[PDB]
Write a protein that binds this ligand. Structure first.
Ligand SMILES: C[C@H]1O[C@H](CC(=O)O)CC2=C1C(=O)c1c(O)c(-c3cc(O)c4c(c3O)C(=O)C3=C(C[C@@H](CC(=O)O)O[C@@H]3C)C4=O)cc(O)c1C2=O
Ligand SMILES: C[C@H]1O[C@H](CC(=O)O)CC2=C1C(=O)c1c(O)c(-c3cc(O)c4c(c3O)C(=O)C3=C(C[C@@H](CC(=O)O)O[C@@H]3C)C4=O)cc(O)c1C2=O
Lengths: 213, 209
């Protein structure tokens, strides 16, 4: 062991995790890479759970919640989200982690704070700015999973196409809509589906917002 | 006692409700029906392809209604709530969901039914196909979250995330201080109705002229 810290340990874990995925991450695996005994490891970071939280928190430094600006709101919200997504893309299995874990931690609440600022900044009231953030982050995760599981795109490529084949060759009299919509369902264009989900939620917010009429 | 795939999955779902997903091995299920891996793998295939059918059998509890003059936005919600009750009446069912497509026979009927309703409001091809997809995710996510509160059939932990957040330095964390309640604890029935409205209105803006 060289000078071990709760940061060199984490930067190490993540290293393995990109490389090889969630299940290859174990305590014994980790302590191996770093050239140390279980003592030093369990000291800074604990069992496997705690470790994933620390892993989660550190990569978060990557996202950016911009400071509120004169009439850029909608875009400033898209920026923010599109930023968070770019994060999930680089790092294997990170979304899997996110589903059953608290959005807590240094980065975790320096992040909520700036998320709440910007939203409330849209002339949005309490309950709606609170929940709103939940829904966005919820929205962007799900998406990131969806993409997570898409050679590369050859297995998905043909599956999608064989799905697209069955749909159109379905009978028209009993299935007018699905015959009509075989593309827009099987479309494996995540980029544009993503900008859509955003357009929608956001307008749902703005509309939600100034309801006081 | 003629064994059939429908009988197989009524037992696999009967133990899933009564004991819990994590305990549904192929092993267990086989014992219950007093039958070998032979006859069980003969229909349903393996643990994973079996789930698909379990999911596809229960989706029968969802009732997408026939489109009616003036009431579009209303009809959508009824559909959205009925899905949510399905997830509410069987444990772990969401966990499964967030891994699988509704390519099942059952699944396909309601995709047609749903998309018909959505396209009745003035939703151009695209809007409507993702409108649906979008709505699916939201209701799925919610129920996973609801199930995590442990009800149906913890509020100790949450209350302790309220104290904690409220107790931050007020100047460095004003927004987090002021929103302590609505973030930590929130009635589940309230959080659903909000997102439903949000998205529906969101899709409505999408329709335009
Ligand atoms: C790291 C932190 O700051 C960076 C920028 C910086 O300051 O360096 C940007 C950022 C930071 C940050 O901490 C952050 C968040 O914590 C959240 C966020 C806030 C939340 O309140 C939540 C979630 C969130 O992602 C969830 O993913 C989820 C939930 C609830 C659960 C529900 C379930 O258990 O199934 O689902 C997912 C895991 C949630 O409540 C959403 C966000 O968009 C962000 C951010 O954008
Ligand atoms: C069974 C079928 O018919 C009944 C009506 C009847 O039987 O008379 C009603 C109904 C039926 C039906 O099949 C149905 C659906 O298939 C869907 C649906 C449509 C979809 O397009 C999807 C999902 C869906 O549940 C997902 O759960 C999911 C995805 C994709 C993934 C992505 C992820 O979250 O990681 O998430 C889950 C697995 C999805 O695309 C959403 C729905 O609201 C419905 C329905 O309401």
């Amino acid at each position: 062991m060289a000078p071990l810290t709760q940061d060199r340990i984490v930067v190490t874990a993540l290293g393995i995790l990109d490389a090889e995925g969630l299940d290859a991450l174990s305590m014994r695996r980790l302590a191996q890479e770093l050239k140390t005994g279980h003592a030093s490891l369990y000291a800074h970071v604990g069992n496997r759970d705690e470790l994933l939280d620390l892993v989660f928190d550190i990569v978060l430094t990557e996202v950016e919640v911009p400071e509120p600006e004169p009439g850029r709101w909608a875009e400033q919200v898209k920026e923010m989200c599109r930023s968070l997504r770019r994060m999930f893309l680089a790092h294997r299995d990170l979304a899997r982690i996110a589903i059953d874990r608290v959005p807590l931690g240094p980065n975790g609440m320096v992040g909520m704070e700036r998320t709440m600022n910007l939203l409330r900044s849209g002339g949005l009231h309490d309950e709606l700015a609170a929940y709103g953030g939940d829904l966005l982050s919820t929205f962007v995760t799900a998406e990131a999973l969806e993409q997570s599981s898409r050679q590369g795109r050859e297995q998905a490529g043909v599956f999608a196409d064989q799905l697209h084949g069955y749909l159109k060759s379905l009978p028209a009299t009993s299935f007018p809509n699905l015959v009509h919509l075989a593309g827009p369902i099987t479309s494996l264009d995540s980029d544009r589906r993503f900008e859509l989900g955003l357009e929608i939620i956001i307008a749902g917010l703005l509309a939600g917002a100034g309801e006081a009429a």
